[PDB]
Structure 1
Amino acid sequence: LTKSLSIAFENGDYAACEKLLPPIKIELIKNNLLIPDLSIQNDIYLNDLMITKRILEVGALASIQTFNFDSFENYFNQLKPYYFSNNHKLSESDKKSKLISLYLLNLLSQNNTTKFHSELQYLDKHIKNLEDDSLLSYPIKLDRWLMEGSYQKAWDLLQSGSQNISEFDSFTDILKSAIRDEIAKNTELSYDFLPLSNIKALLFFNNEKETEKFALERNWPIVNSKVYFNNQSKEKADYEDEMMHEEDQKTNIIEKAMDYAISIEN
């Protein structure tokens, strides 16, 4: 029963994992009661810890492989404290190194960069040279190129990242899109028009018809093969003036002078 999830991952049938999990979820609580969740560790608890850990890990990879990113986020959270607490005598796995690489890509693909840096601070001491960066290089080097601003080098690491498959393609293909939108924002400031050909190279497409359709949906008009970045920016700006919170945030002249006198006179 509980062992069937473990052998189901080996099949390669990863949707069969998810449809088999619910009974194992109720049976996972019983596993959690055996360990004290590591408020003391003993050698009777050491053999049980492998059992509790093993069910989390195989579900974690199976959920990413059916593109259930939400489910994965929960599994990672549960797993982390188990590696975290104790002197090493069972606090790692062959799967752990692969697992951390996938979670770091998930935060980049959703573009929560604030939590990307906080998480790696905490991670730093589990992977420094003990599980050393051997697959973790993939999100870390990509982050280096993105902080620098080299969208070029960042694109290449994605291109060459499809040769090696562990399961990373479920986040590589999201990351391809993230790069386009970031470049799409920056180019508004730079100038008002690029010819169509110069757009396709910078925003990374393989069809000129994709380039133009992407522009229409983003509210740029291509008229006489010149893009007008300035449309969307006008439209966003109009919206802000359309809502009203607004008089005091900008602070009228009268308001400033009223403020001075009443501070004095209390």
Structure 2
Amino acid sequence: NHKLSESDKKSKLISLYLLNLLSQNNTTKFHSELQYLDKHIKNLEDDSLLSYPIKLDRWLMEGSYQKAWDLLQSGSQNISEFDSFTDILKSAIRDEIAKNTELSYDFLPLSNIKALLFFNNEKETEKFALERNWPIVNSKVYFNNQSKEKADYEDEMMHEEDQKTNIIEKAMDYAISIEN
């Protein structure tokens, strides 16, 4: 049933799975585990430990990564158990911000990237730009990667190259055979 002594007893280990699941950038399985809990408004809503990933993901969906980053620092639960999933989830948050900084920032200097993503070193800031293929000039960082291509294999679908002229004529020949 639900009753042994303390029921779920430790609430921190249950929240470890919800915090570590977001490190893979999967938002579908995050809300699926919340439905698995028997009491949504009793154990999940009242206790701040089970409500920690909900309030953390709430700021992630609203778009604010600065308030979500403060929960992994000012919180006193990051000492022992949550220390393992702190830096791992923080690395996934910074990687998620990097996807936003491409489209939302046409040009940004080097000093701001350190402050926005909470970097402790300017040389380490440029190291992250090399793995993400970010062009670097004096006191500025541009993005030439806004254009996308490759993405596994695709043929005659999603903005083709040399078949554009044919597919337009092929779509006209498909309706003729349906009537015939």
Change (3 A) 1:209 1:233: farther
Change (3 A) 1:211 1:122: same
Change (3 A) 1:103 1:212: same
Gaps of 5+ in 1: 1-86
Change (3 A) 1:148 1:254: closer
The percentage of counterpart residues that share the same residue type is 100
Indicate if the aligned counterparts of 1:219 and 1:232 stay in contact, CA closer than 8 A.
no
Gaps of 5+ in 2: none
Indicate if the aligned counterparts of 1:101 and 1:135 stay in contact, CA closer than 8 A.
yes
Larger Rg belongs to = 1
Q: Deviation at 1:101?
A: 0.9
Correspondence for 2:14: 100
Number of residue pairs aligned between Structure 1 and Structure 2: 180
Change (3 A) 1:169 1:231: same
Indicate if the aligned counterparts of 2:102 and 2:145 stay in contact, CA closer than 8 A.
no
Change (3 A) 1:244 1:200: same
Which whole-Å deviations, capped at 9, do the CAs of 1:77-125 have from their partners, x for residues lacking one?
xxxxxxxxxx334386464422211111111122211100111122252
Q: Deviation at 1:206?
A: 0.9
Indicate if the aligned counterparts of 1:97 and 1:131 stay in contact, CA closer than 8 A.
no
Correspondence for 1:12: none
Q: Following the alignment from structure 2 to structure 1, what is the Cα–Cα distance between the partners of residues 65 and 138?
A: 28
Query: So what's the TM-score if we normalise by structure 2?
Result: 0.79
Indicate if the aligned counterparts of 1:97 and 1:135 stay in contact, CA closer than 8 A.
yes
SS of the equivalent of 1:252 reads helix
Q: Following the alignment from structure 1 to structure 2, what is the Cα–Cα distance between the partners of residues 120 and 174?
A: 21
- Higher relative contact order (Cα pairs below 8 Å, separated by 6+ residues): 2
Q: Name the one with the larger helix percent.
A: 1
User: What value does the CA root-mean-square deviation take over the aligned residues?
Assistant: 3.8
Q: Deviation at 1:147?
A: 1.0
Change (3 A) 1:227 1:237: farther
Correspondence for 2:2: 88
Query: So what's the TM-score if we normalise by structure 1?
Result: 0.56
Q: Following the alignment from structure 2 to structure 1, what is the Cα–Cα distance between the partners of residues 86 and 142?
A: 30
Q: Following the alignment from structure 1 to structure 2, what is the Cα–Cα distance between the partners of residues 242 and 140?
A: 42
Indicate if the aligned counterparts of 2:16 and 2:82 stay in contact, CA closer than 8 A.
yes
